[PDB]
Design a protein around this nucleic acid. Structure first.
Ligand SMILES: [Ca+2]
Ligand SMILES: [Ca+2]
Ligand SMILES: [Ca+2]
Ligand SMILES: [Ca+2]
Ligand SMILES: [Ca+2]
Ligand SMILES: [Zn+2]
Lengths: 178, 113, 173
DNA sequence: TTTTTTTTTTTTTT
């Protein structure tokens, strides 16, 4: 299975809690301050600096600013090609895996392409809609967790209220991290 | 660690003293090709944008991301990024700016652990 | 009819999905019959192209584009053919055929050359937001594949209006 | 209406 790429503000990624999976094949993920488990990120911003391509072409990187935060986007080996596509000033949409290096979250480029200014507007509208949807669902799930915890009874109650069972596990994991 | 400060979205009339990097969106009304400067009008005011290399055309709708320069001659913006916002729906952008201003502080304050 | 990827089922018909191009599996061209668009065989004994349904035909180059699409709620494989694929790729099928030939001459099979050309030359298409319309078929191992009949650029005002409707349902407006 | 058939995973950076 290929889990979805979550459309988020760069601030939400930066303020999140990166989770490094111990297994060599388990995907790494991030848990936001609003208890959102994120495997892949989908952001829309402006390339603020001319890309950095290593002389030896081992890595290529570029910076994206969306107004809420600034994040680095990285492509390694042949993937350096992604960084060559962009230029300083381009308004782009980026999809990729969330990574953490030197305790700073970043995006491992899976795809980057130039977008129309109305796509940036659509991105902001969608990001806010998804955020409100998630917060309201997580608020109800938090009340269930505080009253019953992770039990067979709480899982039935969560399904009845349109809450995924996975959401209760995310809350428990976030409580353990904090 | 001086990390890049994200460009703060503002209107020309709402620029604050504490702002160091801003994002402005407007229409070009005058271009000085010798001093590499241009006049941007967003509807709320006119800002003098100093450009290093890219000069837009007169009447073009552009988005500028720049650093604010405060001198004895006034406040001018040293442009870092100039994007073509000619086909951009500024009505939709204005509507989303108001939605974010109203809803974002409420969403953050809903966290009761 | 607009449906989120999380709601898509096998056998779904006339589904409209708006999402981001996430992966490019294979880019290749094959000789096809101009009438039925099926793969034609070259007969070395007669020197002619034979279609199983129409016999001796003049072949046309058909482009195949296999990629993935993500809408924030799910992921789905997508396949585009001919003119729709050529329009998205921005490269002529004759030019793609020449590049596939160069890769095959280097010791790669047709399957290997198609995957290589998608990663090396058509990686630029990834990250692009598009609207795909088609029917969903279920592959016995590849999973759900959306056979896209057409693709088009996103109408941002239409999409923003859909989001405003969802915000009204949440009590924002 | 079509060709051909094996999904997705990590880790690497002056
Ligand atoms: Ca890759
Ligand atoms: Ca400039
Ligand atoms: Ca069905
Ligand atoms: Ca076609
Ligand atoms: Ca068509
Ligand atoms: Zn035929």
């Amino acid at each position: 299975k290929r889990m979805p790429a979550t459309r988020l503000y760069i601030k939400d990624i930066l303020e999140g809690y990166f989770v490094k999976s111990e297994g060599d094949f388990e995907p790494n993920y991030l848990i936001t301050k609003y208890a959102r488990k994120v495997y892949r990120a989908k952001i829309v911003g402006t390339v603020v600096r001319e890309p950095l391509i290593a002389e030896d072409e081992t890595y290529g990187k570029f910076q994206v600013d969306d107004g809420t935060g600034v994040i680095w986007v990285l492509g390694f080996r042949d993937d350096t090609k992604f960084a060559k596509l962009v230029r300083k000033g381009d308004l782009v949409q980026v999809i990729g895996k969330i990574a953490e290096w030197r305790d700073d979250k970043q995006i491992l480029v899976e795809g980057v392409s130039k977008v129309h200014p109305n796509m940036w507007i659509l991105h902001r509208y969608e990001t806010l809609k998804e955020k409100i949807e998630h917060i309201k669902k997580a608020k109800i799930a938090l009340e269930i967790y505080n009253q019953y915890g992770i039990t067979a009874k709480s899982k039935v109650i969560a399904k009845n209220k349109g809450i995924e069972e996975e959401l209760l596990e995310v809350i428990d994991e976030l409580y353990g991290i904090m | 660690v001086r990390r890049r400060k994200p460009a703060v979205e503002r209107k020309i009339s709402e620029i604050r003293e504490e702002d160091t990097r801003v994002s402005l969106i407007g229409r070009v009304i005058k271009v000085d090709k010798m001093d590499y400067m241009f006049w941007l009008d967003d509807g709320t005011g006119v800002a003098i944008i100093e450009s290093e290399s890219d000069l837009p055309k007169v009447g073009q709708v552009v988005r500028v991301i720049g650093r604010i320069i405060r001198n004895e001659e006034g406040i001018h913006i040293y442009a870092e990024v100039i994007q073509d916002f000619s086909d951009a729906d500024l009505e939709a952008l204005e509507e989303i700016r108001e939605l974010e201003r109203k809803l974002l502080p409420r969403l953050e304050g809903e966290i009761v652990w | 009819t607009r449906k989120k990827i999380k709601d898509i089922e096998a056998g779904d018909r006339f589904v409209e999905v708006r999402g981001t191009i996430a992966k490019v599996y294979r880019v290749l061209t094959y000789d096809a019959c101009p009438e039925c668009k099926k793969k034609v065989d070259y007969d070395e004994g007669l020197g002619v192209w034979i279609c199983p349904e129409h016999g001796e035909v003049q072949p046309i180059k058909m482009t195949i584009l296999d990629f993935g699409l993500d809408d924030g709620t799910g992921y789905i494989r997508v396949t585009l053919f001919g003119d729709d694929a050529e329009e998205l790729l921005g490269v002529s099928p004759e030019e793609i055929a020449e590049k596939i030939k160069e890769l095959e001459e280097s010791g790669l099979t047709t399957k290997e050359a198609a995957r290589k050309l998608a990663e090396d030359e058509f990686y630029n298409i990834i990250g692009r937001e598009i609207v795909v319309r088609g029917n969903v078929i279920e592959d016995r191992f590849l999973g759900l594949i959306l056979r896209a009949s057409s693709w088009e650029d996103v109408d941002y005002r239409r999409e923003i209006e859909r989001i405003k409707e969802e915000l009204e349902k949440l009590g924002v407006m």
